[PDB]
Amino acid sequence: ARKGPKRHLKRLAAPTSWYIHRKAYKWAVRPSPGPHSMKTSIPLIYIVRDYLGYAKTAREARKILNEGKILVDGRVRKDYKFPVGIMDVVSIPETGEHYRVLPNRIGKLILHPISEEEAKLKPFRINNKRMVKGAKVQLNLHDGSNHLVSLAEKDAYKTSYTVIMQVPERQIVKVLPFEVGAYVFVTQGKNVARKGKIVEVRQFPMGWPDVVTIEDENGELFDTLKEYAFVIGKDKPEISLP
Amino acid sequence: ARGIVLEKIAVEAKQPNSAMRKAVRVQLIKNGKVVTAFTPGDGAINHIDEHDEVIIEGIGGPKGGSMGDIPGIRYKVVKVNRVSLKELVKGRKEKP
Amino acid sequence: AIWQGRSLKKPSGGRIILARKKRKRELGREPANTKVGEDREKRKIIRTYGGNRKVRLVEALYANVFEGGKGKKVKILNVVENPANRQYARRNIITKGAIIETEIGKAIVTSRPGQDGVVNAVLIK
Amino acid sequence: GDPKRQRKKYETPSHPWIKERLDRERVLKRNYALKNKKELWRHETQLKEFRRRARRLLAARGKQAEIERQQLLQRLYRLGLLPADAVLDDVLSLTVEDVLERRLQTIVYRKGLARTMKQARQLIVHGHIEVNGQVIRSPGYLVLREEEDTITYAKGSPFAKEGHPERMVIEQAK
RNA sequence: GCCCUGCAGCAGGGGCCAAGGGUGGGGGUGUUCACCCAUUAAAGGGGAACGUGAGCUGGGCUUAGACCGUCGUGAGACAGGU
RNA sequence: AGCCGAGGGAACUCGGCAAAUUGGCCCCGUAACUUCGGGAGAAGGGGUGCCUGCGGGUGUGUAACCCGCAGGUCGCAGUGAC
RNA sequence: GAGCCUGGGCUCCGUGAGGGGGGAGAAGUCGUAACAAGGUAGCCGUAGGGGAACCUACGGCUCGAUC
RNA sequence: AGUGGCGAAGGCGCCCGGCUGGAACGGGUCCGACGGUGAGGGACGAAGGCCAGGGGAGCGAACCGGAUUAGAUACCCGGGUAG
RNA sequence: AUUCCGGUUGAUCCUGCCGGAGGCCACUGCUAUGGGGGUCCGACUAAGCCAUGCGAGUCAUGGGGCGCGCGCGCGCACCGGCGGACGGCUCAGUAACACGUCGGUAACCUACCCUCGGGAGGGGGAUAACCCCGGGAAACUGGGGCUAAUCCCCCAUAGGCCUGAGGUACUGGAAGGUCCUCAGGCCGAAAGGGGCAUGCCCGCCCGAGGAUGGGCCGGCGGCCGAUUAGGUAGUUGGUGGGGUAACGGCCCACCAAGCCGAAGAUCGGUACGGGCCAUGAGAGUGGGAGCCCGGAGAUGGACACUGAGACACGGGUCCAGGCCCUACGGGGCGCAGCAGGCGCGAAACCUCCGCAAUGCGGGCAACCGCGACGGGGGGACCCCCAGUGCCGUGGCAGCCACGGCUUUUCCGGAGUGUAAAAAGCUCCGGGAAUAAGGGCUGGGCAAGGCCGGUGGCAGCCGCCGCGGUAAUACCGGCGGCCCGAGUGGUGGCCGCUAUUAUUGGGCCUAAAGCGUCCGUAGCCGGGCCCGUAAGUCCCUGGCGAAAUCCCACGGCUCAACCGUGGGGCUUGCUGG
């Protein structure tokens, strides 16, 4: 009978969103708690070793990470267990490389190369709102982060809008609302990695979540959950997507 | 199953046949019960003394039971002191 | 050992055989029979499940009485009419719901002193 | 539950002592120089799997169904058993002689590199035969349609010299 | 305490002098005796009105009541049982 | 003719003769067998004093006779003797 | 709240002097019940009897032959 | 007296009278699906047997005899208790 | 291959059972050349007992001292911090919200991690190490002196909790929730530390959220028994309280008599559950040790301390049952961890090498450690690929002699391979050398109507049946058939079997219609019109882990195996 928390992960029990050989070895790296969920993230060791190929062994990868060479959201990360997730930027200045982390049409995480100018912005979806002592407004975002705003501009933010920010200093830019002609990118579900414009929203009683209808870029309609719709623009995306 | 011998015996065959099949009473080491086992081969009963160790198998019959000429018996000998009775009979061995 | 975990009987009247040992999570503690003191008031501090803290009263002398927003601090005389047990008034044991006698008058206890370490009461008309 | 074990890729006959089947298999074994019964049954099982897939896919509705259909036909074309203009119904006419003809031993025989199937087997096992750029030592490799014109003697091999005695004796027939 | 031995020693057989002291506890049976158990240095045997009822007990035996079996026509009887 | 006896507990005796043990009331629980009526109070187990109060039944009743409850307290022992 | 003792409840196996029927095996002894109208047609239900197969009585059926 | 009839089956035969159950036929009568089968439960149910009370001609288990038979606990004959 | 064959008679047609013929698992007889791959090897009987060695450490960038070498550098123990509650092993107990799936917690806790907002003020103290004495057989352990910290305590401030009266700013489907104001009270922080340097790195405390891991609740689903029929008494509910991290008869005081059950309660039996596995044309029948998820346990039973987390597998206390040392005073242990040993049995391996790969703990890092893991050793575990010669002339009826060829395999050697080896792979020399057995041979059923021996004896026989002096059936030899590095025997499951019958069986005479009727539950129910949309059908959203199964392409020579992608499986649940 287990008497405490887990500290190990077997490869056959790893999440499907990863690109990992399951029958090669017995153990996998167990991610440490952090910004994103376990089903929507992946550690840095795998990005450095198995995705880009800058190393063949975990010792080399750990040396690279501890020398202060990899940035995430503009910050040096040395922990090989740190999880990287959707809409995150991975940058390497000694090679001028910049990648955005996104999902496939299967649900697996890939790196899409971007430019050094767009690598300075990250969109954050608002997941919740709170009042904190002193009468301040706290927005709780999708990566698990938090942001403070004043009481006077509380109506300019809601629980499904998107906020674009300069990532190392975290200053707000270009709020994008949830409306009936907004452009959205789907992150989870069966229609993952699709994009389109909103058409209709539907509410339901007693806990059942709301639903949203979307029109494809060629005329086809589909549906999904309003929590899986990530606003990225008004009529034209504001980041380079695949 | 293993067993220890107690007594050699001979059973009369069923009609309309006529013969004496050689058999042996065996005491089992698992539970102490006594059964009867058939000795196949010509002269097999000569290569078996009392207090010799014996391995017992089923004889092979309808519904895991007895065979044609000798009803009442269900088991046969396979080894005598850890040696194959077929080899004993054919003469390709010598029992210790 | 107060196990506080589960009943060994179904509602159908049948028996249930426990398939494991008692876990430390399920246990309780002895009740704080909070009495009216004489010259001192005694408290206890308990370390709990997640490193958290609880304060117990054992002997009480003062109460915080409230009448329409404003509150005062007074002394406790005899207990009157605890409707949770018949012996508690005689033994002068205070629990939530008990009616006490103070310098002002009569008051209903609104707090759980075995959990909070304080006696708060609302004055009666 | 229980984990999975690896299972045979061949099947045995239901009855072992039927005269018709015995005669047929004896003739085939003698003519194709097969070591034992197990080989025959392997090729027959290959054919049976093809036939079962055909029967299952025949007149079935679905994108995955047509995908599987095209995959089957293209795999057969590539193995060299059917031509490019072939229909599903043409699989139910195949025989085990086709699979037995598509193997390296039989092909090394037909192409005149050996005088007998036994000689061909010996050459293949000793390493005197090279497919397009690779030595192979399994007489049942099932040569593909795109490699039958690239079979010859290995670079380092006594049989690679025009004036080898056994090579002369072999060429005698052709 | 001594003698012979088919007494090496440990123990055994057989015999001589010696009656000063010891020789017990339990199961079945009315029992004496005999039989068995565990201990013990060994757990000897006899006499004294088969020592001892003006000392005890009263289980047996041997009056008057009653039952069984057998014998007898019967009344009845039995060094037969209860 | 009576009372008490440490440790053991029928080793006594024909034989547990004699003596001892149990004991009133309320509650729990109750076998084989059976002529279904009994056995049966089977067996076995727990409680009981004094004081301070609270309730019920019949009754017109702060008349009388009965049935329950809580709390406090003393002793080796509360059907304390009979 | 273990453990010890104690009084009960249920149930599987364990062991026991000795009795009853059952089954095989040799076929030994007394009879001749069943198959033909088997020499008293056979069979069911109930009751009584007898060394044994069986006999008898009341009611029933034909799975009974003949004129 | 039937190769007949009535009855859920078991079973029911002299005549007359009373009380009663069911079915067939005929029917521009009434109701308007109210139906089928039925675990469990219930009621009826030959002969024989048992209990209590009455009766008892004939027949007749048991039993008593006479014959046959190698033997006869049987078949046949004469009596006869229960029923 | 959606299959049949033998057996009741003097001969025939049926019914019905037995047997043959196929696959998988365990044990075993005889026999055995090579390589590769894989999730195999004390599970079945004893969750029985254990000698010896190992399986959990790490930090000098937290502190003081001591020793060794030129204040500096190396080494040792102590104090202190983190971890040791994971990983690993087994299947006894459990018929249960234990498991599976869908949902909920607005009724809860969470050290290490992430983000944001804020703080680090003032004092004090003890004591290991060390020095002087020791006691004790050991296990262990006393006194005095001296001392530091990221050790311990106190004050302050922030902050946490309870209650009451108001305002209605936030989320959500919905506020016993969050925010603002006022009041009365309880509890009550912090290491401005270490390093580099002329500010940076690693760290400490508080608050709001998240993440990770758990706790609790509900709907639905999942063995056999009636020769087990009534069961339950805190039992079912309510009011008020206590306790808990939290809702709750979880526990208590009082008020009622309720709760389950022939649609099978209760009681008993057996059993870890699932993903999955075997078999079969399928419908279906059976199993669920090895890999993954979950549960439970650490000789049997109970009870506690410390910690974010335990009622603790290599920590503690007692009882029972076993054992070991002893100076007899007292002390210590339980391999269901890796090797290894005893015993029980029909039935299961070396007391080996390494942290090079994958991972975990500690550490700023460099790195250290790990019987996890990796690597080899032994084993007729499972699967894939091969071998024990080929060619030509002649001869006989497949084999002989003559001549020639090759070297997978065998013997030896050099490289590469490997943590180091070994195997394997390239190459060189030698040489047809070095390598077939097991069962059967009357009919089912394939292959002798040959020789000898024995003579109802001996022996054979799944079943039918052979043997009594001429044996195609026993034993041996000579021939021949089947499979083939494998081939036979014994037990178990599926199929055979329409002998369990939904698909898809039978009841006059072969087994089988209650003696007849009435009727309760249940099952089955005439025709037309209107409505509803519970069942039913279509479409679309969120779920049903991975591995395992089917197909194609690609990488180890091909393959078994591994990788990429498309389908399936998950017997189904739920929003429109």
XYZ file of N, CA, C and O (backbone and C1' of nucleotides) in Angstrom, chain C residues 1 4-7 9-13 19-24 27-29 31-32 45 47-50 52-54 56 64 66 69 71-73 84-85 95-96 110 112 114-118 120, chain I residues 93-96 98 109-110 162-165 183-188 215 231-233 235-236 240-246 248-250 253 259-260 266-267 296-298 303-304 306-311:
535
model
N -8.877 4.582 21.290
C -8.650 5.102 19.947
C -9.967 5.299 19.208
O -10.648 4.333 18.869
N -13.566 6.456 13.959
C -14.326 7.491 13.267
C -14.353 7.290 11.756
O -14.529 8.251 11.006
N -14.197 6.053 11.291
C -13.973 5.805 9.883
C -15.115 5.179 9.110
O -15.342 5.539 7.951
N -15.843 4.248 9.716
C -16.788 3.448 8.950
C -17.584 2.564 9.895
O -17.122 2.234 10.991
N -18.778 2.183 9.456
C -19.641 1.287 10.208
C -19.457 -0.143 9.724
O -19.314 -0.393 8.525
N -21.617 -2.436 9.571
C -22.918 -3.005 9.259
C -23.553 -2.265 8.092
O -23.475 -1.037 8.009
N -24.184 -3.023 7.201
C -24.962 -2.448 6.118
C -26.326 -1.990 6.620
O -26.772 -2.391 7.697
N -27.017 -1.148 5.847
C -28.402 -0.807 6.206
C -29.358 -1.976 6.086
O -30.407 -1.967 6.741
N -29.033 -2.979 5.268
C -29.822 -4.200 5.192
C -29.739 -5.040 6.457
O -30.490 -6.012 6.582
N -28.850 -4.698 7.385
C -28.643 -5.474 8.585
C -27.493 -6.451 8.524
O -27.257 -7.163 9.507
N -11.307 -5.056 5.447
C -10.296 -5.658 4.595
C -8.951 -4.950 4.694
O -8.108 -5.107 3.806
N -8.734 -4.171 5.748
C -7.468 -3.475 5.921
C -7.398 -2.932 7.339
O -8.397 -2.879 8.059
N -6.192 -2.536 7.731
C -5.969 -1.950 9.040
C -6.477 -0.514 9.083
O -6.725 0.123 8.055
N -6.628 -0.005 10.300
C -7.056 1.371 10.488
C -5.945 2.329 10.088
O -4.777 2.134 10.436
N -6.314 3.369 9.351
C -5.376 4.377 8.891
C -5.364 5.565 9.844
O -6.385 5.931 10.429
N -4.182 6.160 9.994
C -4.007 7.306 10.877
C -4.872 8.492 10.472
O -5.176 9.341 11.316
N -8.618 8.840 12.396
C -8.787 8.875 13.839
C -9.294 10.229 14.316
O -9.072 11.263 13.682
N -9.992 10.203 15.452
C -10.407 11.395 16.147
C -9.703 11.556 17.481
O -8.725 10.874 17.792
N -10.229 12.479 18.281
C -9.623 12.822 19.557
C -10.698 12.921 20.626
O -11.898 12.866 20.347
N -13.097 14.504 23.514
C -13.818 15.778 23.561
C -13.282 16.704 24.638
O -12.824 16.272 25.697
N -13.339 18.000 24.343
C -13.013 19.042 25.312
C -14.297 19.429 26.029
O -15.107 20.197 25.505
N -2.977 23.602 22.554
C -2.663 23.758 21.140
C -2.364 22.383 20.567
O -1.579 21.622 21.144
N -1.392 20.066 17.072
C -0.872 19.942 15.719
C -1.709 18.920 14.962
O -1.999 17.841 15.486
N -2.089 19.255 13.733
C -3.089 18.489 13.003
C -2.548 18.027 11.648
O -1.351 18.113 11.363
N -3.468 17.541 10.811
C -3.132 16.729 9.646
C -2.001 17.329 8.818
O -0.960 16.697 8.617
N -2.195 18.537 8.302
C -1.213 19.102 7.395
C -0.261 20.083 8.039
O 0.108 21.089 7.426
N -1.157 21.840 10.517
C -2.021 22.936 10.905
C -2.241 22.916 12.416
O -1.701 22.073 13.136
N -3.084 23.825 12.896
C -3.154 24.149 14.312
C -4.600 24.259 14.766
O -5.459 24.742 14.023
N -4.860 23.798 15.988
C -6.161 23.955 16.626
C -5.967 24.403 18.068
O -4.993 24.027 18.723
N -7.841 24.623 21.820
C -8.880 24.106 22.699
C -8.985 24.945 23.962
O -7.969 25.357 24.529
N -17.668 36.916 25.190
C -17.894 38.092 24.358
C -19.362 38.105 23.955
O -19.797 37.280 23.145
N -22.865 39.974 22.461
C -23.203 40.845 21.347
C -24.681 41.200 21.393
O -25.530 40.342 21.660
N -24.731 44.449 16.949
C -23.571 45.027 16.298
C -22.428 45.351 17.235
O -21.263 45.118 16.899
N -20.321 44.883 20.808
C -20.001 43.770 21.669
C -19.235 44.214 22.898
O -18.558 45.242 22.908
N -19.355 43.404 23.947
C -18.667 43.642 25.205
C -18.080 42.334 25.710
O -18.385 41.252 25.204
N -17.236 42.448 26.729
C -16.561 41.312 27.341
C -16.944 41.247 28.810
O -16.806 42.238 29.535
N -28.288 19.934 24.658
C -27.620 18.823 23.996
C -27.404 17.629 24.910
O -27.187 16.518 24.414
N -27.457 17.835 26.222
C -27.309 16.765 27.194
C -27.805 17.284 28.532
O -27.675 18.472 28.837
N -21.231 24.328 25.531
C -21.142 23.982 24.123
C -21.966 24.988 23.339
O -22.667 25.828 23.908
N -21.870 24.906 22.017
C -22.709 25.729 21.162
C -24.178 25.438 21.436
O -24.587 24.278 21.533
N -22.832 30.983 20.381
C -22.835 30.822 18.937
C -21.555 30.197 18.403
O -21.454 29.960 17.196
N -18.066 27.341 18.740
C -17.614 26.014 19.146
C -16.294 26.171 19.887
O -15.224 26.205 19.262
N -14.426 24.214 21.623
C -13.460 23.146 21.450
C -12.686 23.212 20.154
O -11.694 22.490 20.008
N -13.115 24.053 19.217
C -12.424 24.252 17.952
C -11.809 25.634 17.812
O -10.794 25.776 17.130
N -12.396 26.649 18.449
C -11.999 28.033 18.252
C -11.280 28.651 19.443
O -10.532 29.615 19.253
N -11.486 28.135 20.649
C -10.854 28.701 21.828
C -11.403 30.045 22.254
O -10.636 30.913 22.684
N -12.718 30.237 22.157
C -13.339 31.507 22.509
C -14.830 31.264 22.675
O -15.420 30.441 21.972
N -18.346 33.103 22.400
C -19.091 34.232 21.868
C -20.577 33.941 22.000
O -21.028 32.825 21.723
P -6.908 -17.034 2.293
O -7.428 -15.648 2.880
C -7.415 -15.398 4.298
C -7.691 -13.943 4.606
C -8.934 -13.335 3.980
O -10.068 -13.628 4.784
C -7.112 -11.856 3.709
P -11.512 -13.763 4.128
O -11.704 -12.391 3.342
C -12.174 -11.227 4.004
C -12.249 -10.042 3.073
C -13.289 -10.115 1.964
O -14.590 -9.745 2.392
C -11.215 -9.446 1.054
P -15.844 -10.726 2.161
O -16.190 -10.582 0.614
C -16.359 -9.299 0.024
C -17.432 -9.282 -1.039
C -18.803 -9.812 -0.616
O -19.836 -9.020 -1.201
C -18.040 -10.998 -2.504
P -20.575 -7.890 -0.332
O -19.382 -7.166 0.437
C -19.583 -5.937 1.117
C -18.417 -5.006 0.918
C -18.665 -3.828 -0.014
O -19.244 -2.722 0.658
C -16.674 -4.936 -0.652
P -14.333 0.469 -1.030
O -13.168 -0.035 -1.990
C -11.908 -0.433 -1.473
C -11.355 -1.608 -2.234
C -11.298 -1.448 -3.747
O -10.159 -0.741 -4.203
C -12.359 -3.477 -3.234
C -5.202 18.445 3.198
C -4.352 20.527 3.878
C -5.570 20.187 4.721
O -3.374 21.279 4.575
C -6.590 21.284 4.903
O -7.240 21.598 3.682
P -8.448 22.633 3.639
P -2.481 22.363 3.794
O -1.581 21.494 2.811
C -0.565 20.643 3.317
C 0.043 19.782 2.241
C 0.792 20.511 1.138
O 2.107 20.886 1.509
C -0.648 18.904 0.179
P -13.012 30.830 10.646
O -13.595 31.245 12.069
C -13.869 30.258 13.051
C -14.490 30.843 14.293
C -15.720 31.709 14.099
O -16.896 30.954 13.877
C -14.258 32.730 15.659
P -18.073 31.542 12.956
O -18.709 32.702 13.841
C -19.343 32.401 15.073
C -19.569 33.633 15.911
C -20.440 34.712 15.298
O -21.822 34.411 15.367
C -18.541 35.698 16.303
P -22.802 34.831 14.167
O -23.070 36.377 14.423
C -23.674 36.809 15.631
C -23.579 38.302 15.805
C -24.077 39.144 14.648
O -25.490 39.239 14.611
C -22.031 40.020 15.456
P -26.251 39.414 13.208
O -26.080 40.962 12.883
C -26.429 41.942 13.846
C -25.922 43.308 13.461
C -26.218 43.746 12.041
O -27.549 44.201 11.876
C -23.974 44.272 12.590
P -13.692 50.009 14.982
O -14.486 48.947 15.862
C -15.558 49.366 16.689
C -16.268 48.206 17.340
C -15.401 47.224 18.106
O -15.004 47.705 19.378
C -16.968 46.040 16.791
P -13.616 47.221 20.026
O -13.977 45.815 20.677
C -15.073 45.693 21.569
C -15.383 44.252 21.876
C -14.198 43.392 22.272
O -13.832 43.559 23.630
C -15.531 42.237 20.688
P -12.299 43.387 24.067
O -11.799 42.188 23.150
C -10.944 41.181 23.661
C -11.427 39.808 23.280
C -10.350 38.745 23.158
O -10.012 38.194 24.418
C -11.827 38.630 21.296
P -8.520 37.688 24.723
O -8.552 36.160 24.286
C -7.350 35.429 24.126
C -7.526 34.279 23.171
C -6.263 33.808 22.472
O -5.478 32.940 23.271
C -7.980 34.081 20.878
P -3.899 33.186 23.421
O -3.295 32.644 22.052
C -3.441 31.281 21.689
C -3.106 31.042 20.239
C -1.722 31.469 19.783
O -0.709 30.545 20.133
C -3.332 32.178 18.205
P 0.752 31.069 20.547
O 1.240 31.906 19.283
C 1.546 31.263 18.054
C 1.728 32.251 16.932
C 2.891 33.218 17.072
O 4.128 32.643 16.693
C 0.949 34.398 16.410
P -6.641 7.955 -1.822
O -7.496 8.725 -0.723
C -7.099 8.714 0.638
C -7.919 9.665 1.469
C -9.427 9.500 1.388
O -9.921 8.442 2.189
C -8.875 11.784 1.179
P -35.193 -15.035 11.625
O -34.327 -13.799 11.119
C -33.014 -13.997 10.622
C -32.437 -12.748 10.004
C -32.106 -11.603 10.947
O -30.891 -11.790 11.652
C -33.193 -10.764 9.018
P -30.700 -11.140 13.109
O -30.724 -9.570 12.843
C -29.672 -8.937 12.132
C -29.876 -7.448 12.024
C -30.110 -6.699 13.323
O -28.921 -6.474 14.059
C -31.639 -5.945 11.685
P -28.869 -6.796 15.633
O -29.602 -5.553 16.304
C -29.064 -4.242 16.182
C -29.543 -3.331 17.282
C -29.691 -4.002 18.649
O -29.333 -3.148 19.750
C -31.800 -3.187 17.916
P -24.837 -0.690 14.937
O -26.253 -1.119 14.343
C -27.007 -0.217 13.548
C -28.275 -0.843 13.027
C -29.166 0.072 12.200
O -28.756 0.157 10.847
C -30.475 -1.093 13.798
P -28.471 1.584 10.172
O -29.921 2.184 9.902
C -30.578 1.961 8.667
C -31.882 2.709 8.575
C -31.837 4.196 8.884
O -31.330 4.989 7.829
C -33.655 3.231 10.016
P -31.441 21.386 14.723
O -30.660 21.165 16.093
C -31.082 21.822 17.277
C -30.332 21.343 18.493
C -28.820 21.445 18.431
O -28.355 22.759 18.681
C -29.445 19.340 19.320
P -26.878 23.191 18.235
O -25.955 22.603 19.389
C -24.624 22.192 19.126
C -24.211 21.070 20.039
C -22.794 20.556 19.860
O -21.837 21.352 20.533
C -24.300 18.732 19.988
P -20.435 21.704 19.836
O -19.559 20.391 20.045
C -19.206 19.948 21.346
C -18.655 18.546 21.327
C -17.414 18.320 20.474
O -16.219 18.663 21.154
C -19.011 16.611 20.063
P -14.960 19.255 20.355
O -14.511 18.071 19.391
C -13.880 16.907 19.903
C -13.707 15.856 18.841
C -12.983 16.297 17.577
O -11.574 16.268 17.703
C -14.964 15.157 16.988
P -10.671 17.300 16.872
O -10.726 16.752 15.382
C -10.292 15.438 15.079
C -10.661 15.044 13.676
C -10.198 15.979 12.572
O -8.842 15.768 12.211
C -12.468 15.399 12.230
P -7.768 16.959 12.309
O -7.778 17.602 10.855
C -7.604 18.997 10.654
C -8.189 19.418 9.334
C -9.673 19.125 9.162
O -10.481 20.182 9.645
C -8.465 18.294 7.294
P -11.878 19.882 10.369
O -12.826 19.381 9.194
C -13.346 20.300 8.247
C -13.842 19.616 7.002
C -15.056 18.718 7.164
O -16.276 19.440 7.201
C -13.421 17.626 5.845
P -22.605 16.989 8.715
O -22.730 15.403 8.662
C -23.735 14.785 7.877
C -23.485 13.311 7.690
C -23.505 12.455 8.943
O -24.808 12.160 9.411
C -21.627 11.883 7.646
P -25.134 12.267 10.981
O -24.557 10.917 11.591
C -25.186 9.670 11.324
C -24.366 8.508 11.817
C -24.857 7.136 11.364
O -23.751 6.243 11.225
C -24.934 7.251 13.711
P -22.621 6.485 10.105
O -21.333 6.899 10.945
C -20.174 6.077 10.965
C -19.167 6.543 11.985
C -19.663 6.659 13.419
O -19.646 5.420 14.103
C -18.440 8.603 12.830
P -25.808 8.204 25.241
O -26.714 9.503 25.402
C -26.574 10.353 26.530
C -27.527 11.522 26.479
C -28.981 11.195 26.180
O -29.701 10.771 27.324
C -28.281 12.996 24.820
P -39.236 2.329 6.218
O -37.816 1.607 6.178
C -36.647 2.318 5.798
C -35.424 1.439 5.817
C -35.456 0.225 4.901
O -35.119 0.532 3.560
C -34.725 -0.430 7.047
P -35.779 -0.296 2.355
O -35.093 -1.730 2.449
C -33.700 -1.885 2.229
C -33.270 -3.326 2.303
C -34.121 -4.328 1.543
O -33.869 -4.343 0.151
C -33.656 -5.173 3.692
P -27.794 -9.266 2.256
O -27.922 -10.281 3.477
C -28.039 -9.805 4.808
C -28.423 -10.902 5.768
C -27.357 -11.945 6.070
O -26.431 -11.524 7.057
C -29.405 -13.023 5.590
P -24.894 -11.990 6.991
O -24.962 -13.580 6.911
C -25.159 -14.365 8.079
C -25.242 -15.839 7.768
C -24.024 -16.462 7.108
O -22.968 -16.742 8.010
C -25.955 -17.156 5.961
P -5.114 -0.282 0.159
O -4.707 -1.687 0.786
C -5.676 -2.506 1.419
C -5.224 -3.940 1.515
C -3.962 -4.189 2.322
O -4.207 -4.243 3.715
C -3.870 -5.395 0.282
P -3.147 -3.638 4.756
O -2.009 -4.746 4.842
C -2.282 -6.026 5.385
C -1.158 -6.994 5.127
C 0.210 -6.581 5.645
O 0.372 -6.875 7.023
C 0.390 -7.404 3.420
P 1.398 -6.041 7.935
O 2.793 -6.774 7.710
C 2.918 -8.172 7.935
C 4.197 -8.727 7.365
C 5.474 -8.265 8.061
O 6.430 -9.327 8.075
C 5.542 -7.638 5.785
P -5.704 -1.181 17.651
O -4.516 -0.465 18.435
C -4.569 -0.321 19.844
C -3.330 0.326 20.407
C -2.955 1.680 19.838
O -3.745 2.728 20.371
C -1.015 0.328 20.084
P -3.602 4.223 19.804
O -2.182 4.695 20.345
C -1.544 5.849 19.825
C -0.099 5.894 20.238
C 0.768 6.928 19.538
O 0.657 8.215 20.122
C 1.875 4.833 19.563
P 5.062 13.580 18.549
O 6.159 13.459 17.403
C 7.544 13.531 17.707
C 8.391 13.345 16.477
C 8.025 14.219 15.293
O 8.581 15.519 15.403
C 8.353 11.981 14.571
P 8.059 16.715 14.473
O 8.786 16.451 13.083
C 8.351 17.100 11.903
C 8.344 16.157 10.730
C 7.293 16.432 9.668
O 7.663 17.461 8.766
C 7.251 14.144 10.228
P 6.709 18.739 8.564
O 5.402 18.141 7.878
C 4.249 18.943 7.680
C 3.465 18.507 6.469
C 3.128 17.029 6.383
O 1.994 16.675 7.156
C 3.959 17.782 4.298
P 2.079 15.474 8.220
O 1.679 14.181 7.384
C 0.638 14.207 6.421
C 0.925 13.247 5.297
C 1.382 11.860 5.732
O 0.294 10.982 5.976
C 2.892 12.729 4.125
P 0.027 10.377 7.441
O 0.931 9.068 7.488
C 0.949 8.168 6.389
C 1.517 6.819 6.747
C 0.945 6.164 8.006
O 0.682 4.779 7.774
C 3.312 6.310 8.163
P -0.715 4.330 7.113
O -1.303 3.237 8.106
C -1.520 3.538 9.477
C -0.285 3.257 10.287
C -0.286 1.936 11.060
O 0.870 1.143 10.725
C 0.169 3.783 12.526
